[PDB]
Coordinates of all heavy atoms in Angstrom, one line a residue:
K1 N -32.6 -17.6 139.8 CA -32.5 -16.2 140.3 C -31.3 -15.5 139.8 O -31.4 -14.3 139.4 CB -32.5 -16.3 141.9
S2 N -30.2 -16.1 139.7 CA -29.0 -15.5 139.2 C -29.1 -15.2 137.7 O -28.7 -14.1 137.2 CB -27.7 -16.3 139.4
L3 N -29.8 -16.1 136.9 CA -30.0 -15.8 135.5 C -30.9 -14.6 135.3 O -30.7 -13.8 134.4 CB -30.5 -17.1 134.8
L4 N -32.0 -14.6 136.1 CA -32.9 -13.5 136.0 C -32.3 -12.2 136.4 O -32.5 -11.1 135.7 CB -34.2 -13.7 136.9
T5 N -31.4 -12.2 137.4 CA -30.7 -11.0 137.8 C -29.7 -10.5 136.8 O -29.6 -9.3 136.5 CB -30.0 -11.2 139.1
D6 N -29.0 -11.5 136.1 CA -28.1 -11.1 135.0 C -28.9 -10.6 133.8 O -28.4 -9.6 133.1 CB -27.3 -12.3 134.7
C7 N -30.0 -11.1 133.5 CA -30.8 -10.6 132.4 C -31.4 -9.2 132.7 O -31.5 -8.4 131.8 CB -31.9 -11.6 132.1
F8 N -31.8 -9.0 133.9 CA -32.3 -7.7 134.3 C -31.2 -6.6 134.3 O -31.4 -5.5 133.9 CB -33.0 -7.7 135.6
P9 N -30.0 -7.0 134.7 CA -28.9 -6.0 134.8 C -28.4 -5.7 133.4 O -27.9 -4.5 133.2 CB -27.8 -6.7 135.6
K10 N -28.4 -6.6 132.4 CA -27.9 -6.3 131.1 C -28.8 -5.2 130.4 O -28.3 -4.3 129.7 CB -27.9 -7.5 130.2
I11 N -30.1 -5.3 130.6 CA -31.1 -4.4 130.0 C -31.4 -3.2 130.9 O -32.2 -2.3 130.6 CB -32.4 -5.0 129.6
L12 N -30.7 -3.1 132.1 CA -30.9 -2.0 133.0 C -30.4 -0.7 132.5 O -31.2 0.2 132.3 CB -30.3 -2.3 134.4
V13 N -29.1 -0.6 132.1 CA -28.6 0.6 131.5 C -28.9 0.7 130.0 O -28.6 1.7 129.4 CB -27.1 0.7 131.8
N14 N -29.4 -0.4 129.4 CA -29.7 -0.5 128.0 C -28.5 -0.4 127.1 O -28.7 -0.4 125.9 CB -30.8 0.5 127.6
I15 N -27.3 -0.2 127.6 CA -26.1 -0.1 126.8 C -25.0 -1.0 127.3 O -23.9 -0.9 126.9 CB -25.6 1.4 126.7
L16 N -25.4 -1.9 128.3 CA -24.4 -2.8 128.9 C -23.9 -3.8 127.9 O -22.6 -4.0 127.9 CB -25.1 -3.5 130.1
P17 N -24.7 -4.5 127.1 CA -24.1 -5.4 126.1 C -23.2 -4.8 125.1 O -22.1 -5.3 124.7 CB -25.3 -6.1 125.5
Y18 N -23.7 -3.6 124.5 CA -22.8 -2.9 123.6 C -21.5 -2.4 124.2 O -20.5 -2.5 123.6 CB -23.6 -1.7 123.0
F19 N -21.6 -1.9 125.4 CA -20.4 -1.5 126.1 C -19.4 -2.7 126.4 O -18.2 -2.5 126.2 CB -20.7 -0.8 127.4
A20 N -20.0 -3.8 126.8 CA -19.1 -5.0 127.0 C -18.5 -5.5 125.7 O -17.4 -6.0 125.7 CB -19.9 -6.1 127.7
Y21 N -19.3 -5.4 124.6 CA -18.7 -5.8 123.3 C -17.6 -4.9 122.8 O -16.6 -5.3 122.2 CB -19.8 -6.0 122.3
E22 N -17.8 -3.6 123.0 CA -16.8 -2.6 122.6 C -15.6 -2.6 123.5 O -14.5 -2.3 123.0 CB -17.4 -1.2 122.6
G23 N -15.7 -3.0 124.8 CA -14.6 -3.0 125.7 C -13.8 -4.3 125.6 O -14.0 -5.2 126.4
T24 N -13.0 -4.5 124.5 CA -12.2 -5.7 124.4 C -11.2 -5.8 125.5 O -11.0 -6.9 126.0 CB -11.5 -5.7 123.0
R25 N -10.6 -4.7 125.9 CA -9.6 -4.8 127.1 C -10.4 -5.1 128.4 O -9.8 -5.9 129.2 CB -8.9 -3.5 127.2
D26 N -11.5 -4.6 128.6 CA -12.3 -4.9 129.8 C -12.7 -6.4 129.8 O -12.7 -7.0 130.8 CB -13.5 -4.0 129.9
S27 N -13.1 -6.9 128.6 CA -13.5 -8.3 128.5 C -12.3 -9.2 128.8 O -12.4 -10.2 129.5 CB -14.1 -8.6 127.1
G28 N -11.1 -8.8 128.2 CA -9.9 -9.6 128.5 C -9.5 -9.6 130.0 O -9.1 -10.6 130.6
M29 N -9.7 -8.4 130.6 CA -9.4 -8.3 132.1 C -10.4 -9.1 132.9 O -10.0 -9.8 133.9 CB -9.4 -6.9 132.5
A30 N -11.6 -9.1 132.5 CA -12.6 -9.9 133.2 C -12.4 -11.4 133.0 O -12.5 -12.2 134.0 CB -14.0 -9.6 132.7
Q31 N -11.9 -11.8 131.8 CA -11.6 -13.2 131.6 C -10.4 -13.6 132.4 O -10.3 -14.7 133.0 CB -11.3 -13.5 130.1
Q32 N -9.4 -12.8 132.5 CA -8.2 -13.1 133.3 C -8.6 -13.2 134.8 O -8.1 -14.0 135.5 CB -7.1 -12.0 133.1
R33 N -9.5 -12.3 135.3 CA -9.9 -12.4 136.7 C -10.7 -13.6 136.9 O -10.5 -14.2 138.0 CB -10.7 -11.1 137.0
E34 N -11.5 -14.0 136.0 CA -12.3 -15.3 136.2 C -11.4 -16.5 136.2 O -11.6 -17.4 136.9 CB -13.4 -15.4 135.1
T35 N -10.3 -16.5 135.3 CA -9.4 -17.6 135.3 C -8.5 -17.6 136.6 O -8.2 -18.7 137.1 CB -8.5 -17.4 134.1

């Protein structure tokens, strides 16, 4: 269920993966929060 929800949310805005790839600072902040 979580994998399906994550797959549906990535293609929901249709620019979520590109935005996450362009946001290096956001990715670093998310990694720090997960750690």
